[PDB]
Symmetry: D2
Subunit: 423 residues, 4 copies
């Protein structure tokens, strides 16, 4: 054993650049932190290795818990914290393992994918797998990206609603839009402002900037561009007050009709045709039952519940699983799960099942944020969409959006079949 | 090195109960699986240890990838798969580490909590921490659970809309409700049917069963009860057809006005008062600016975007982080993030900031599903709400809902201050 | 001719109770009004006959118009103003004739109705007529009232959200509800409080009182009851502040999900089955086309437009026409037109067209307001629902709601057939 | 007295062009109609005068009523039916008088208006008048038209969702849009296609054509243009099926988020500043109370009710009254009443009340439909906006929209003051 050296003493070893942390014990570091000498947030930098830093943070936290042994089974060792510091999380005390299953092969646009799904919900992966199998036997699915651009919705305020109208009119002209577009586009190589969407409420003006962002999800880049554009706008209207760079008009991570109607991020449609025989043998139902359930649950049931954009069975399940697996911001599922699922009869006999999923607001990226960590990069890699696509910028993000829509469609197929076979 | 024994041979070692898997190589197991002898889904059971089983699955998957080395940095070893098999995930190929940070202390209802947040979004934990600090300096927050019950919304169909009306009327009487309540309650000790909510659309009848479920999230239990109740209902109306046990009328994991208006799971309100001085020094703004931004972003901005239940800054961020940390079903954030944030002036001088968050549909549990895994249990434990509360059933789930609402409120405070200080 | 006597002089004739207005000229009355002696609003009382009073008001108004001859073709003579004064309109300058057509016979619940429709929209009545004919040939329609009660949604405020929670909890107990119900019911013979619906937002508590109101539309009576109930509630919580007797939580004359989900006024469902032959010969289409159009316009189209409660073709047309004809408050069409139209195949061959309309929020009455005028009473009379039904209170209002739903259904049938035959 | 001549006989007088109807009695005409010789719908043409024709129709209808005397007080005489036949109504049996009151002067954009309001709701005109007075004392209101174009939302269907994507992409190019614009614009002098808005759902493509329409409301003209444009589109995609010219994507006469977000018809904003003294003396309240009520009723209350576009007190009342007075299609109030009302403190002391109303979807016209009748033209004339404005097409419709927004704002001011003074 041993015992803790006084503070002033300990604060010196820390300073000796040939004899630093590593000559101090956990108790000595604890003492230094408690005297408010060391800032606990700097532990991963201040300590010898990053792992130790998180160890020290864990010990400190444990001391303050009603059950000191709470963190025992929270894993923290043998994890690369270098990539998380100053990028992804703060006050780190370990990591939360989420089991990763694989659904597939998903036969989409003449290719095959193996889709990783990080979930703690039993049977979700198996159900998605059955849907994938049905689609595969059906001759594969097809998808298209319909629109692409991340949006940011700042709110500005003018002295009078008349002034707000003037600003809106000026933004609607070709010259004003050109000036704003130049200012916005100057901030990055992928910043290419598309048509603006404005909304007035009294003297509040809400401006929705939209743009592609390469392979990144685009929030940071769009925000930077917006800021620059708002400065430029302020030059012409010095009385304008920028109230908030985010005025809930984007709309980011909230249910909003605007995302459903205008789109946000990527808008995708996927479709497939399942032969009648396959619907019988794999899905254990019939086309007629599937259509009946689809109409009376996904359309009418959602309408009676007063849903905007929730005209599907469980798109949120698949979207969340894939998002967590692939390092996406999982909160964005709120907006990204918007989907409408349609089923119809098809074929020369009206016996085959046509299915389509439409998802207008898939917010997704393959660069930046959570996609900078190796484990999430692995899941992106097994799909073939990891990182930036140098040849055709944004192609990887588009492909990932297509895969997400296809997987959602497989999940819908399976769950709807299960509900229709019923009991 | 060595080389693979033939199939028939290999299939025998597998059978010898004194000489089973463990005498076979990875290549031999691969051969057996490829001949369709072994079902790959049974690998974790079929193999010697579970870890090997997932190893075999990983090798098989790697062979089919365009980049065989994709899984290199997806971790799978030294993880307890026994708790995941047949409960939480299928076709497991490893786990996805999500960094866990800690925000707090959160001073809520005269107690202090240390809230784990699993996120890959930089600065989220720090911002929540600043909000927690402001609330703490403000004399702590207060919360109340207003309603509690998980819901399931089956859809049934009658021959005619007149028959649907008859069934609805019968469900509305005391005798019919009593019969249905008895049938529903017989299925479990926590199943206590509360008042029914019906909606007709033509000959479709949508019935929303609601009930408390102890400390479990309640989906499985509510579904079981619903099934039993629907059988009982079928006894009185033999012409009734149960179309789907889930008719999107719950509503589960979709944006729906019904959850916002009636509630789903737990309905919570939290409030605090931040002194003016604290708003100046910690939040770097003023009360007036905070109220202006709150009105013109969370209320008016959300209204212009056509939001139902999205009258907040970023409740989804906090909700998702906590949910992933604590083993909740993360897809449920779709419904659980519904929140309205209100700010007003308060105090003898109208200088202090009153803030409140109202979240009517927090779907949450501390037993079952993802909460059965030790790492997620650790995060539940550091909050003091892990598992069932034997004395007062459902108390732990209620406490967790209160903490979620309080943390959301801290996050709102911080983000709104950041937006208001602006630039 | 003649010329105007001085004011003081003229003000005396007005006073002589044997020689009053009628001895004064229009110019003399004009002079008196312009000197601010007579209050123009009292003209119909102050003048000899009411008609003259409105004549004087018209002359005064004409003097102030840029085109003095504007009122020439606005009719005002030979109209009974006695019933409008102090009841229905103020500053009356005449009346606006709305042409009234008749659609029918509508074969509903084994009776025949002749439905008056006041419209200036060409072809609306003819289209409704064709729908009525199709329904009649189909063996008539059937309807049911599913729920009945007008609602008022006051908002009150407590010092703290905790206090609001306390009040909500107290309202949810049997004793508190009993006290409130007694207070509410004491105000009128039809005031019978049904279950309360509360919603908290911070320290705001929104309370939705619901009740039947006999044959009246019920707004006045419900408001009176609410006031009394709120006074009683204030007795138990002296800190409560009644912020507004209408907190937009009713919700009255605004689009709101709450009316769609919970109902407001009368909730009705109507249905019919149209034989295939009749669909061919009268509607000039086929059942399959009708169902296709219904799904892809009323369900999917409305979903893509982000509609709450607008899952129909043109229910608002029929509702407005009937409401204007029958003396209903026409603004209420905003809420009353909420409808979902469903069409399916039916019969032994799936060749016949089953149609149903569901309208959960028909706000309607046959006593009070506009129903006190003879012309509107005539339209109510030709339906057989005029005034109060002494035997079975509220029966006439219910019948009128059924007729409204049936007529809406006929209109939907016709318009949908027209759209499907297309070109 | 006399008695009825036989049919064959009577059918001949009808034919004699020197001795036609007018030599036949009401009983003889009745006999002819009942033998199915005369088509009752042709009565106004077939009879001598139009008035007689409606008389005959009334007698026929009376015979079939349970109370033959029902029509006694439904007026039909001395009304110009020539303008209603083949334009405005069918099977006419008279007209429904709606009392017309006048609110004003409304001081708007430096002019004064006298606004006619056709209502049977007591106190509505008086309340609007008080609001007008307050605004007038406040130095008048200001308004701006922000956007202008009526929309039509057809739905077309392609064989596959991929084909729908192809069509959407083609519509998004400059060349495709140019072709469609040419085809659309060829149909009328006011048809000037603006940017298209498309939405896919599976293989359904919803296209929202928008355009100004001169002074007409524009539905007929927009529909004609759409038809022509869809034919042109069919030329390039022969597999396209036009499913419905109206796919509920306009959206016409239904609550829809799309009208709220994108606008429909005219988008208007109006504002005023009420001095504190005027708020005290005329409105009998204070600015602080007004703002409190506005926030907690029009914003928070509407949010809790799950309103899209209903963030106001009673805009529907004013809109309906004006619409009925001025010959507008009253059903359109459903969409046209969408409004958000905002109140703030203003002035050097924050004592004055700033108010603004924003109405993005005012559907309105001053030519065609109900505006072709003299009584409604009178109400349009007293506003100075009757008919087409030859110099500046569409100016009259824009002015009327501004007046509607201003009147709505006055009504909001008054009602909100009444609610705030409370009791």
């Amino acid at each position: 054993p041993r015992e803790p050296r006084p503070n002033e003493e300990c604060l010196q070893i820390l300073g000796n650049a040939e004899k630093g942390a590593k000559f101090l014990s956990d108790a000595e570091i604890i003492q230094l932190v408690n005297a408010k000498h060391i800032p606990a947030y700097k532990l991963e930098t201040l300590m010898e290795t990053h792992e130790r830093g998180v160890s020290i943070r864990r010990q400190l936290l444990s001391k303050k818990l009603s059950e000191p042994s709470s963190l025992q089974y929270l894993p923290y060792r043998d994890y690369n914290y270098s990539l998380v510091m100053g990028a992804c999380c703060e006050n780190v005390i370990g990591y939360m393992p989420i089991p990763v299953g694989v659904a597939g092969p998903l036969c989409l646009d003449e290719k095959e994918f193996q889709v990783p799904m990080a979930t703690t919900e039993g049977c979700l992966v198996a159900s998605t797998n059955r849907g994938c199998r049905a689609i595969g036997l059906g001759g594969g699915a097809s998808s298209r990206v319909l629109a692409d651009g991340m949006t940011r919705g700042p709110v500005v305020r003018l002295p009078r609603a008349c002034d707000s109208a003037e600003v809106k009119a000026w933004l609607e002209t070709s010259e004003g839009f050109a000036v704003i577009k130049e200012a916005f586009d100057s901030t990055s190589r992928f910043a290419r402002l598309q048509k603006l969407h404005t909304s007035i409420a009294g003297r509040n003006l809400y401006i929705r900037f939209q743009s592609r962002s390469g392979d990144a999800m685009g929030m940071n880049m769009i925000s930077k561009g917006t800021e620059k554009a708002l400065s430029k706008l302020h030059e012409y209207f010095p009385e304008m007050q920028i109230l908030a760079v985010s005025g809930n008009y984007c709309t980011d991570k909230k249910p909003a009709a605007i995302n459903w109607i205008e789109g946000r991020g990527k808008s995708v449609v996927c479709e497939a045709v399942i032969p009648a025989k396959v619907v019988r043998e794999v899905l254990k139902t019939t086309t007629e039952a599937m259509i009946e359930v689809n109409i009376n649950k996904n359309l009418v049931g959602s309408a009676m519940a007063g849903s905007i954009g929730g005209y599907n069975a469980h798109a949120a399940n698949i979207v969340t699983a894939i998002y967590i697996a692939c390092g996406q911001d999982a909160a964005q599922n709120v907006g990204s799960s918007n989907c409408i699922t349609l089923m119809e009869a098809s074929g020369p006999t009206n016996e085959d099942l046509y299915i389509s999923c439409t998802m207008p607001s898939i917010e997704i990226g393959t660069v930046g944020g959570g996609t900078n960590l190796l484990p999430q990069q692995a899941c992106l890699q097994m799909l073939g969409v990891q990182g930036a696509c140098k040849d055709n910028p944004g192609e990887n993000a588009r492909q990932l959006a297509r895969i997400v829509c296809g997987t959602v469609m497989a999940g819908e197929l399976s769950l709807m079949a299960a509900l229709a076979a019923g009991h």
